[PDB]
């Protein structure tokens, strides 16, 4: 009590459920968003199976599990299982009840209207939550990084968002939503692996791809020039003894899948690279508002952690684009967790009161209290 109220900081997506205690800086409790059943039948008696297996408990013992995925970048295949995903957050890891402290979540811009009330209903009209809010993904990282004037491109795993926020919100738009990040690359690898007697089919092993990915996979400085270099067996082939029992000397499999990012043609979409749409969104704004945008670019998310992601952007943009101001790309120490660094802030602020929703406020405006307060 005294000078302590304790506020939770959560940020869920399509890869990790980031959570902490109170006033923290970095995410303490983290676990994969998974929830399946026992295709096997639990021994059924050596426990009335139930618990789909979740948290650092399901990922530990995959194989047996029939992992089913609820949140495919935005759309939720089913909300009934979501109840048993949040039953793992506050209870197992955080070890605190939601009927005590507030709550903070993230908002993927342009989210279905039906999802607003559905989510809020799960808490207030069921699991008593005194107060909560659902802040907008990107905007959070802006302040934490210490930027006032920037163009943000937040992309962790779910979807891509080109948010030219550098002074205010809710203008025309200059924002886009693309389903081409993280999990999209995870499903693409197994496709091409078939050309080398490898086929990670189901979800259980599909997760292993993610593991092997974040330890060697890279983005070619220039696919065209590295083609002739492929002859050399030093900078391409990299041994990786699968901790299960298989040696895969990945060489041309590391920078072939990530290429899909710049080449949406490899997934059947007329959409251009992420540097074309960048122009598309900037041109719809004022004319005297660009010179400062190019000066400072905010690239956050785990997608920017790959080796050979920032340098390439400074090669293609400068080619066909205004060439007067300095070109600089900002990549903070841990540009992935930049969202959580800023997420913790708003939760620890007091001015935040004149924004969130209070217990009584809901009953005063009914279920439409959401779109009546926030937007």
């Amino acid at each position: 009590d005294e000078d302590e109220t304790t506020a939770l900081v959560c940020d869920n997506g399509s890869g990790l459920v980031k959570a902490g205690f109170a006033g923290d800086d970095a995410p303490r409790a983290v676990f994969p968003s998974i929830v399946g059943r026992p295709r096997h039948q639990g021994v059924m008696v050596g426990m009335g199976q139930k618990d789909s297996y979740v948290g650092d408990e399901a990922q530990s013992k995959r194989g047996i599990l029939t992992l089913k995925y609820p949140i495919e970048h935005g759309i939720i295949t089913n909300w009934d299982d979501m109840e048993k995903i949040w039953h793992h957050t506050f209870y197992n890891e955080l070890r605190v009840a939601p009927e005590e402290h507030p709550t903070l979540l993230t908002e993927a811009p342009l989210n279905p209207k039906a999802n607003r009330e559905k989510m809020t209903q799960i808490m207030f009209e069921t699991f008593n939550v005194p107060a909560m809010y659902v802040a907008i993904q990107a905007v959070l990282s802006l302040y934490a990084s210490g930027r006032t004037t920037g163009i943000v491109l937040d992309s962790g795993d779910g979807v891509t968002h080109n948010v030219p926020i550098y002074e205010g919100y809710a203008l025309p738009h200059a924002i886009m939503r693309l389903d081409l990040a993280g999990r999209d690359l995870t499903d693409y690898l197994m496709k091409i692996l078939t050309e080398r007697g490898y086929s990670f089919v189901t979800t259980a092993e599909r997760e292993i791809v993610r593991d092997i990915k974040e330890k060697l996979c890279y983005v070619a400085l220039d696919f065209e020039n590295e083609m002739a270099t492929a002859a050399s067996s030093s900078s391409l082939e990299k041994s990786y003894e699968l901790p299960d029992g298989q040696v895969i000397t990945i060489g041309n499999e590391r920078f072939r899948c990530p290429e899909t990012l710049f080449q949406p043609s490899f997934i059947g979409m007329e959409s251009a690279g992420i540097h074309e749409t960048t122009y598309n969104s900037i041109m719809k704004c004022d004319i005297d508002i660009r010179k400062d945008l190019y000066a400072n670019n905010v690239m956050s998310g785990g997608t920017t952690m790959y080796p050979g992601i920032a340098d390439r952007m400074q090669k293609e943009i400068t080619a066909l684009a205004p060439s007067t101001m300095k070109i600089k790309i900002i990549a903070p120490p841990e540009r992935k967790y930049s969202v959580w660094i800023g997420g913790s802030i708003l939760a620890s602020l007091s001015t935040f009161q004149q924004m969130w929703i209070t217990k009584q406020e809901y009953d005063e405006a009914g279920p439409s209290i959401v779109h009546r307060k926030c937007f």
Partner: protein
Amino acid sequence: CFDVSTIDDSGEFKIIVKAMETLGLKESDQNSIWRILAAILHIGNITFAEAAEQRTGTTTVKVSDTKSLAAAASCLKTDQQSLSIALCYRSISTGVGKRCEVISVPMDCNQAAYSR
């Protein structure tokens, strides 16, 4: 500032020493206390020669005066290398199981001097 017109520190020391012994802080204990301050002084001889690695906006942090930087790590009795890597580059990844460090990237000078 440094020198004060009303206070005479040089002549006060030997007078304080008697007061130091009055409580129970013998020379043996005195020396042990001076090390703690010496550690602070060693930190005080450590600034950041604004590394000119970056060419324009942002900038990294590098220590040209290794003599002073080494003096601290020497008395702190810690790895000079790890000290420079861990501080200049912050680590974050504490997923309950409890952390995996070292992942990072340089930051501006203001934040470096601030964290310092």
